[PDB]
Amino acid sequence: MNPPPPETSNPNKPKRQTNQLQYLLRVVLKTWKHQFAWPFQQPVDAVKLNLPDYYKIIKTPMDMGTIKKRLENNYYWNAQECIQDFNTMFTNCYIYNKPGDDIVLMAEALEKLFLQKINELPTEE
Numbered sequence: 001m002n003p004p005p006p007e008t009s010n011p012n013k014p015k016r017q018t019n020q021l022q023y024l025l026r027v028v029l030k031t032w033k034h035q036f037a038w039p040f041q042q043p044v045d046a047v048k049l050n051l052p053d054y055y056k057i058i059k060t061p062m063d064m065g066t067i068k069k070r071l072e073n074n075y076y077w078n079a080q081e082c083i084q085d086f087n088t089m090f091t092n093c094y095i096y097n098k099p100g101d102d103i104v105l106m107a108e109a110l111e112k113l114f115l116q117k118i119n120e121l122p123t124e125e
């Protein structure tokens with residue numbers, strides 16, 4: 001009943017490092033240590049949690065484990081692809097859950113930190 005996780009490696013896509021991609025892995029993702037990170041560190045395990053509607057409602061799942069692996073495997077060419085995956089992750093949480101739910105307050109806090117760090121993205125090549 002869970003879907004396979006998102007793809008994290010694709011040798012058919014070209015690979016590069018950029019200052020912004022480095023910042024996304026080393027500053028943004030790592031800043032993973034937050035109090036509230038665990039529910040976002042791996043795909044939502046609908047089987048474990050007995051949430052058979054989760055993947056009926058969320059058709060673009062995303063999570064920080066996936067993002068980290070993507071950054072490590074040079075999956076993204078453009079930083080904005082990675083930023084989009086973060087934003088997807090947050091939006092999923094907002095769609096599935098209701099305001100004032102603990103998990104939503106967790107996501108809001110994580111997203112505020114995420115946004116602060118993106119406002120300090122370094123210069124593009």
Ligand SMILES: CCS(=O)(=O)c1ccc(OC)c(-c2cn(C)c(=O)c3ccc(-c4cnn(C)c4)cc23)c1
Binds near residue numbers: 038041048049093097
């Ligand atoms: C990601 C590791 S996990 O799948 O075991 C896990 C553990 C705890 C979690 O929240 C406290 C979640 C979780 C993550 N996200 C992103 C959600 O949106 C989410 C929504 C609902 C629930 C949940 C747990 N039990 N129930 C009734 C609902 C649980 C979640 C997921």
